[PDB]
Design a protein around this ligand. Sequence first.
Ligand SMILES: NC(=O)c1ccc[n+]([C@@H]2O[C@H](COP(=O)([O-])OP(=O)(O)OC[C@H]3O[C@@H](n4cnc5c(N)ncnc54)[C@H](O)[C@@H]3O)[C@@H](O)[C@H]2O)c1
Ligand SMILES: NC(=O)c1ccc[n+]([C@@H]2O[C@H](COP(=O)([O-])OP(=O)(O)OC[C@H]3O[C@@H](n4cnc5c(N)ncnc54)[C@H](O)[C@@H]3O)[C@@H](O)[C@H]2O)c1
Ligand SMILES: O=S([O-])[O-]
Ligand SMILES: O=S([O-])[O-]
Lengths: 329, 329
Amino acid sequence: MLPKLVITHRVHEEILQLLAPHCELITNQTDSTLTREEILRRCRDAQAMMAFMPDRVDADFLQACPELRVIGCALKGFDNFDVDACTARGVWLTFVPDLLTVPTAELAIGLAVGLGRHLRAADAFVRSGKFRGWQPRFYGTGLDNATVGFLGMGAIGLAMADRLQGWGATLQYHEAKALDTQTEQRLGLRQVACSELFASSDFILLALPLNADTLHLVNAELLALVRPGALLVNPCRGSVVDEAAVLAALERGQLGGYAADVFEMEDWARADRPQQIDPALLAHPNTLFTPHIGSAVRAVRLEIERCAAQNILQALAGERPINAVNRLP
Amino acid sequence: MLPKLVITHRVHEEILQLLAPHCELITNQTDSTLTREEILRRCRDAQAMMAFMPDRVDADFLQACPELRVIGCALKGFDNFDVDACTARGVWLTFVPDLLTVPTAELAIGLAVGLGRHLRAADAFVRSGKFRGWQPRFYGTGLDNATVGFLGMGAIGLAMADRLQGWGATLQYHEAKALDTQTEQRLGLRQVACSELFASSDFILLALPLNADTLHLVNAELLALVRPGALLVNPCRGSVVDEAAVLAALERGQLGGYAADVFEMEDWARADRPQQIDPALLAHPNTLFTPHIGSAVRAVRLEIERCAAQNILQALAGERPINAVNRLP
Ligand SMILES: NC(=O)c1ccc[n+]([C@@H]2O[C@H](COP(=O)([O-])OP(=O)(O)OC[C@H]3O[C@@H](n4cnc5c(N)ncnc54)[C@H](O)[C@@H]3O)[C@@H](O)[C@H]2O)c1
Ligand SMILES: NC(=O)c1ccc[n+]([C@@H]2O[C@H](COP(=O)([O-])OP(=O)(O)OC[C@H]3O[C@@H](n4cnc5c(N)ncnc54)[C@H](O)[C@@H]3O)[C@@H](O)[C@H]2O)c1
Ligand SMILES: O=S([O-])[O-]
Ligand SMILES: O=S([O-])[O-]
C-alpha cells in the first residue's frame, strides 16, 4: 500500500496525478471549507497533509493525529499553525516562501491606485447610466510626487518597491531588520522610525507578518499621527491593524482611505478575534476590499500547489523538505 | 474694456485671480455642463475661451463667435476642436502636452491590475458580508510573465512602459512613429506590427489619439485575432475602439475583459456616435469603468488649468502661445 495524504481544499487535478502513484488521497474537490471536527476525522491516521489559508492547527490537533509526519502548507503566513508544537511532536511544517510574493505585490499596488483614485464609486457612477461626459469630480490622489511609506521590507515590501521604481514617488520604510546600503540606494529607500513613517507618508503599505509583536501594531495612537488624508493599504494580515481604530480614523476624516485583502476575522490563532468585518467599515465610502486574493493568479496557484506537494513527497520519502519552517533530527 | 474670457467649466479660485486683472470673466462655477446654445450665447462676443472635455468647436461655432482670438484647451486630445477651421479664422488653438500624462498612466495600470484580478466583483463580494475566509475563487491574470502590448508609444504609452519596468512582463508595441533604438532598448520594448500585437499580447493598452485614421481602428476583425481571454485597456479615446465589437467579443468570451476611462458617446465631433454606453456593456461582469478621470488628480488639475490660462494670456498679449496646436501668421 501507500502513505495517506489528506488535502483540505481543492487543487488542480494535475497535482493529484503526481501525488497518486505515491499516496492514497483523501481529497476535497469543492469550493467549500470543511468544519474543524471533520478534518481531524480525515487526518486521524493520515501521515501527510496539504493545508491552506482556512486551516487552523494547535497542540490538540497534532495529538489526535500521531501518525502525522508533515504538514505541507501552500501559503506564506503560518501564524495559524503552532510551529513549536509541531517541532516537539516530530512533525514537519512547510510553507511557500516566494511564489505568493509577486501576485500579492501586484494586487497591493492596484489597491493603492484604486483607493487613491476612488475607483469603486467611479465605476458605480458609470454603471448608473448617468455618465454624460467629463465633469470636475472624483478628484483623487496619485503616486507621482507622493511619499510612499512601507512598514516591513521583506519579500512583499521589496516586490512592491521594485514595482514603484518608475512612479516618481519618494520611497521610505521602517523595518525590524534593515537592508544593506546597496539595496537602500538602488531602490531609493530611506529608513525611518515607525512613528515618523506614519506622520509623513501619503500612502502606507503594510508588508509584515502576524506574530506576538505585530498584533494591533497599527493602533488608535499611531493613527492619530498620519497626515489628514493619508491612505492605508493592508495586504498582509488583518490583525496587524486595529480595524475599530481604523474605522474611527476614517469617520473623523483623518484617514483618507483604507484598503485590505486581509481581515481580523481570518486570524483563528487569537480566540478573541472579531467574528466579522464591521458593517460600518464595509459601508464606508473611502475603502477598497478584496477577499484574501493576493495569490489568486491561476498559473501561480498551480505552482504553489506543486511546491507544497513536493515538500510532502520529500518528507514522506524520508528526506528533509526544502521549504520546512522548523528543524528536525 | 478688458478682453472677454468665457470659461466653460469650474476652475480653481486661483486661476480666476490669475486672469481677472487681464480680462473679464464669464464663468461656470458649477459642476454642470452647459447647453451648446448657452455656450454660443456667452462666446458670441468673447475674445477668448477656456475649453474642456465636453466642448466642441467647429467652423459653425467660429462663424457665430467672430471675436475669438484664442481657444485654450485644458486637455491633451483635441479631436473635438477643428484645428484647421481655427487656423483659417486666425484663432489660436492651444492644449496641455504633458501634465495629463502621468495620472492617466497611473490610472491605466490600476485598470489593468483591477481588470485582471476581478477587483470590482471581489469588493462587491466583501461588502456583501459573505466573506468567511479563504476560498479558491476570483482567480485572475497577473502582469508577471504576461506579454503586454501597447498600441501607440507617445507620452502616455511611454509613461506606462516606464511604470511597468519592475513588473516581469514582456513589453511589445506598435507605432506610427517608432522610438529610437536606445529608448526601446532601455525599456525592453519590441516593435511589432499591429495584427501581431493583437494576436500575441495578454494585455493590450491603447495609447493613441482619435482621428480619421484611428476611428474604430480596434474593430471586429482586429479583435478576432486576440488570444482567448486577452485583456483590453482603453485610457485614450472611446472611438478608437468599436464598442459594439468589443461587447460582441466579451459576450463570446474571446475578449477576457475591457476596462475604460473613456467612451464613444464622449466624442462630440462624431455626429453618428452612440448617445450612451450600451447597457449590455455596463452589465458585463468582465469590465471596469471610470468616468474620464485620467487626470482627475487634485494638484495636477490646478496645474492643467494654469497651463491653459498662461496660453490664453500669451495669445491675448499678441504672442505665439507656448502650447499652440496650430501656427498663425
Ligand atoms: N494577501 C496575501 O495573499 C498574502 C500573500 C503572502 C503573504 N501575506 C502576508 O504578508 C506577510 C508578509 O509576507 P512577506 O513574504 O513579505 O514576509 P517576509 O517574512 O518575507 O517579510 C516580513 C518582514 O516584516 C519584517 N518585520 C517584522 N516585524 C516588523 C516590524 N515591527 N516593523 C517592520 N518590519 C517588521 C521582518 O523583518 C520581515 O523581513 C506574510 O507573513 C503573510 O502574513 C499575504
Ligand atoms: N483618459 C484621459 O484622461 C486622457 C488623458 C490624456 C490623454 N488622453 C487621450 O490619449 C491620447 C494619447 O495621449 P498621449 O498624451 O500619449 O498622446 P501623444 O500624442 O503623445 O502620443 C500618441 C501616439 O500615438 C501614435 N499613433 C498615432 N497613430 C497611431 C497608430 N495608428 N498606431 C500606433 N500609434 C499611433 C503617435 O505616433 C503618438 O506617438 C490623447 O490623444 C487623448 O485623446 C486621455
Ligand atoms: O500567507 S497567505 O497565503 O495569507
Ligand atoms: O485629453 S483628455 O482625455 O482630457
